[PDB]
Amino acid sequence: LKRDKGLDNTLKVLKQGYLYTTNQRNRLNTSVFQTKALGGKPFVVVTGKEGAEMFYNNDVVQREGMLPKRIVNTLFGKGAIQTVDGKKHVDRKALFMSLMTEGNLNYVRELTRTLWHANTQRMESMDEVNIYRESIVLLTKVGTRWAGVQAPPEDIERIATDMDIMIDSFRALGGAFKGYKASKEARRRVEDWLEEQIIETRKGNIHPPEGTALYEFAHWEDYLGNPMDSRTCAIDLMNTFRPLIAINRFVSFGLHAMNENPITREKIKSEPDYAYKFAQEVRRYYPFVPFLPGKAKVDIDFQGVTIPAGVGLALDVYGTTHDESLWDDPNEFRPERFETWDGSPFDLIPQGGGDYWTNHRCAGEWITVIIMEETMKYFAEKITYDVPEQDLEVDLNSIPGYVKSGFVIKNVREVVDRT
Template sequence: MSTIKKHKGLDNTLKVMKEGYLYTTNQRRRLGAENIFETRVLGGKRALVISGKKAAELFYDNDKTERSGTLPKRLVNTLFGKGAIHTTTGKKHIDRKALFMSLMTEGNLKHLRELTRNHWYMNTHRMEQMDQINIYRESIILLTKVGTKWAGVQAPEEKIEEIATDMDIMIDSFRGLGTAFKGYKESVAARRRVEDWLEDQIIQTRKGKIFPPEGTALYEFAHWEDYKGNPMDSRLCAIDLMNTFRPLIAINRFVSFGLLAMHEHPISKEKINNDPDYAYMFSQEVRRFYPFVPFLPGKAKTDIQFEGHDIEKDTMLVLDIYGTMHRDDVFENADEFHPERFLDWDGSPFDLIPQGGGDYYTNHRCAGEWMTIIIMEETMKYFAGKITYDVPEQDLTVDLNSIPGYIKSGFIIENVAEKVDRK
């Protein structure tokens, strides 16, 4: 049996942070390791980095791998929240995941599509009055309005920008990878403010002082009972409630990447306007091609084998998310932006994994993935067909060394005008 190749070093965390999304791919190539290599991170912990479709199948096999206790504590404190569903496993995870999935009704998803379409249209006048629009920033504000409205949460107009800013700070905390990064205290404070605000609404709903519509996230979470018949602790309930719409706000990254892709591939605008299926294919390719989540941690639940290597129970595993989606043996010509690849895609749960893999109900695949696609479809249709705009000179570099990845300029547009056929 061959030996697993190693990236030598007592602790390679700083190297991971320096190389960002490309660390895993770079190391595989340097070491000549096709699907697995060993490194040490987060204080010198031994970790096996696994890559490829078979790696995703292993990582999301509940009998072989688990996620509980593997996320860095600082990242839990800022991005997900203490006790969040992302940190659970087994029956508890399945029970609470069912609550999340109960929101994915045809009516709720249709409502989200309508909210997204209407909010962008109503936002046209605002953008027409602005000299320049930073799409990264503008979309996080708009998606905060969409997300809170969809969730049934009371978010006064004057509070939206504050909420959007706090959400962005929390999402951006991923860059610390659990280390004592400079913005940690700011991220914790941002989370506390949003949790306080949502917990108050949970309590007020339970007391019958506010009345969110039945079927909304606020209503369902406030009235939910676990498999033992117990309501969720109000603070934990606020944390999981936030996790129903926080991922929607993070879609602002995909929105800016989508406009960059349109700019670099202008024929895509015409295709989106003329082909009813193209916005879906385009949105899926944006999710595959551009950086979102670089990798995720887990650990071996039992002694297992992968690619002919024995892996002992409790060994830390790191699934290479970004690298897997950029492998030619997973997606043909993976370094090319080609939406048509999804025309005949088989819908595998183990190759397109920007928001997790496996089964929606029992695994850690994001319950909001369908919502991401809906929001992206409607947003891309809006920018392709409902307005005109100019793209001024700017730095459009996508920084793959930063986690999360960004367009350095945020993607700026100007001279926005409603597109009207007056013939």
């Protein structure tokens, strides 16, 4: 088992970012390697379809307790679905999956569409529009409503900012950092607000619609016959829409892709099924999740080495989505590649891999793709706009992935045939 040197390589991982793991595989000439991080903890980095298949074998890999605690404290919440494994996890995961009906998915589609259409005037009136910011505010509107949570309009900008702080809080991979305290306080504010809504729902003082997250989470009973305690219930209720709001990252990246590859715009407009392919390709190509932590429960034989019991595991998300053998030209943006993708659970893993129901794989992938379809269709078809000189760099050596400027547009004008 080959190794990246030192006693602790955390600073080096942060310096190389999304390119760390691939830099190490190239220079060490291997598909699998160990490194130490987060204070001398050994992690074996696995990649590709075989890496993802093993990482999602529950007989042999633990996820519980493996997330850095500071990231639990800011991004997910204590006792969240991401923190639990086994029967308890499967049971609670089914509640999340139960929201993803045909009707509820068709509703998030309609909400996204209506709100972009309703936002056109505002964007015309602005001197410039930072798409990262504008989209995070619009998606807070979409997400709170889809989840059955009432958010007064005066509070939407605050809530969006709080979510943004939480979403960004994996940047130090669990280390201390300047905004850590502010990040916890943002989370507290959002948990308190949601707990109040769960309490008032259970008390019968408010009446969210049946099939909404707030309704279904407030009333659900676990497999032993118990509802969640109200704080846990608020924490997991946030997990139904904070990551929806995080789609703003992908909205910024999608406008970037359309600007860099103007042929895509035309095809999103003219071509059936293309908005779907474009959305998939934003998720594959652009950086968001670098890797995911786990632990070997037992010795594991893998690609010619033995991973000892008790050692950490890191599934390389960026590496897999950018694997030369899986995608032919992994560093080119080419939506047509999805004409031949066979739907594997183990290659297109930007929001995880494996099985939705028994693994920690994202419950929100359909929603992500639907929002990205409708949002890219809007920007491609419904408005024209200019793109000013600005800093469009996406620095692959810096976690998290952002367009430096946020992606700014100007001179927004609705497309209307008035003849």
